[PDB]
């Protein structure tokens, strides 16, 4: 995964998006959607899907949301107040610590 200061982006298109698959990545600590229900995604169709990925501290996960401020929200990764999409996060202490 990329550092938060230089987060990565992948473009998703021309595919069938099955959202039931990713519920088995973890205990699945955070999953919050804006403008759409987590359970209606399977019934919708989108024109463009982008996946932004990075690693932060657990206490910084709350900054990855519309209207939020702080070191991550302001200097590393900013979302628009009109953001539509879903934020997914899970604990990776078993992989990303030494």
């Amino acid at each position: 995964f990329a550092s938060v200061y230089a987060w990565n982006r992948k473009r998703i298109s021309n595919c069938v998006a099955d959202y039931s698959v990713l519920y088995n990545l973890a205990p699945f600590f955070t999953f919050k959607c804006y403008g759409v229900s987590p359970t209606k995604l399977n019934d919708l169709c989108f024109t463009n899907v982008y996946a932004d990925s990075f690693v932060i501290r657990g206490d910084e996960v709350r900054q990855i949301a519309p209207g939020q401020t702080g070191n991550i929200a302001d200097y590393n990764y900013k979302l628009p107040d009109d953001f539509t999409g879903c934020v997914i996060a899970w604990n990776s202490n078993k992989l990303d610590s030494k």
Partner: protein, 98 residues
């Protein structure tokens, strides 16, 4: 016949009755596009994206707003009816006395 034909405005009070009713209904239709605080003016685009506890909040905004639009139409349509009733009473009086 000449004074009626040479002056298109001669009957410009019967035409006003027609014009006022026509624009009153056009006004109602054009107000369906208003959101009244909702994420969308389209009812089926709310229930398809949000869950019940959220969709109802958005849908209630559209219902309240549109009820006011209809109430305004009825109130003004009722005031206008009184104006016509008054002129009808005059017309009947003149039929009798003239």
């Amino acid at each position: 016949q000449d004074s009626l034909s040479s002056t298109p405005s001669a009957l410009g009070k019967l035409q006003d009755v027609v014009n006022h009713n026509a624009q009153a209904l056009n006004t109602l239709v054009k107000q369906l596009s208003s959101k009244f605080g909702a994420i969308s003016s389209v009812l089926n685009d709310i229930f398809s994206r949000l869950d019940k506890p959220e969709a109802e909040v958005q849908i209630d905004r559209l219902i309240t707003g549109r009820l006011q639009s209809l109430q305004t139409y009825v109130t003004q349509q009722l005031i206008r009816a009184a104006e016509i009733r008054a002129s009808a009473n005059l017309a009947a009086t003149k039929m009798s006395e003239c």
